[PDB]
Design a protein around this nucleic acid. Sequence first.
DNA 1: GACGGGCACGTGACGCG
DNA 2: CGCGTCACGTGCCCGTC
DNA 3: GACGGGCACGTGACGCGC
DNA 4: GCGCGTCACGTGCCCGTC
Lengths: 108, 100, 111, 104
Amino acid sequence: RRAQHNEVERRRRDKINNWIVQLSKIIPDCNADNSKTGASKGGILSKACDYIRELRQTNQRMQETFKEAERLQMDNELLRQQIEELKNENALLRAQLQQHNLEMVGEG
Amino acid sequence: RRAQHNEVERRRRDKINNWIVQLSKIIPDCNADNSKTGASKGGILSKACDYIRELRQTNQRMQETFKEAERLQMDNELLRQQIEELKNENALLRAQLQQH
Amino acid sequence: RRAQHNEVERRRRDKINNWIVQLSKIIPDCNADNSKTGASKGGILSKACDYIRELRQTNQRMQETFKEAERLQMDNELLRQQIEELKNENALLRAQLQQHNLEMVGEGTRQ
Amino acid sequence: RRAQHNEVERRRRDKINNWIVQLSKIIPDCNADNSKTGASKGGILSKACDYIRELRQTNQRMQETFKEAERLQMDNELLRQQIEELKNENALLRAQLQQHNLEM
DNA sequence: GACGGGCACGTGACGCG
DNA sequence: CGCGTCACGTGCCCGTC
DNA sequence: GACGGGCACGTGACGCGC
DNA sequence: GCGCGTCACGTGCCCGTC
């Protein structure tokens, strides 16, 4: 009667534990912490719960540095122009300093 | 009594359920799919199993292109830093040709 | 008379060119940039002048994170004390809710 | 006639001197401490040749440890973010119990 | 003695082609 | 009539106190 | 024809120590 | 009381693109 219902629980409880061990086998943290708390069913959950939080953290780094990728490469064109306008004037003026400082020493 | 041991298990069961519920609240697969088996506790695990293992596979496809994308901001600082090195030399040179 | 001083200068220029190729061999950009201006003597200067700027940018970035790795103890005590303070209160108050939410069904039924 | 080619050589020799002086002004081995023998232009090259050779092995030592040191800020982001989730849940739970007309 | 906390197992309840 | 959710109890083999 | 630019090579000039 | 050793400057020439 309900003794057949005991077997359906045994199936479905076994499903959950075997889902944790598959979960356990794929988190790197559970495969290096030889402890009786990490190896617990309750540990794998809060470990994967964290693992996802950190996997979504790296993923949300990747996305965020793409919305700005067009703008900063646009900035690259700008500051790549600013170096040359400054360097040419830097070279122009260093020629205009180092060749006129010399015209004042022996001016007469 | 054993009434402390019922509370201990109830605490342990509450931590567990709050750790699939937090798990439930974050996987987009079971987010607002309202399934009778998908929203079950055993399903979130298969959904988290299929979300961790998919995010791992994703972020390695990303790191192929991301490391090259990362350098573009390193350069943005670099070439930004060059500007002041030459802006100081330019301003140094700009305030020395005055008396000639 | 000065043909011995042509020897003195040729020695010096050879030193400088071979101090460029020694430089040229140790900058990774010139090691793979088959360019007429990159392979120029003057190119190796502005390539090494950049290559140094970027290594300075890394070490001066690399160390500046150690002045703040001091604050691994900061987020320890932000993790050690704070997260359990709220989790225990979270689990406590969530149990205080759902013990009286069972009496809500007790008081008012649906028919 | 050739006066433009003299000016062109003058510009080219200016760029490389500006490139050794830009080089000289950053290598600490000759950062306004070194003599007339080491501020020699051929000497700055051997010192930049050292500085680069010496920084690559230094850079490679740091990132052996820095990689583990970096993730402390990653976790600082992580653990600072966990606080927000629990604060929202704790704020959610603290006000749903003020409608239960009994706190503790 | 004091309790905790681990994991597996039964039940009743409830919603189901 | 069996499924299948679920939380809740229950020993027990065991920890640390 | 027009200019630029590459690199090697030769000089006077200058600072030097002996 | 001159051997070195700095350095920039010119110059051919072997050669690019406009």
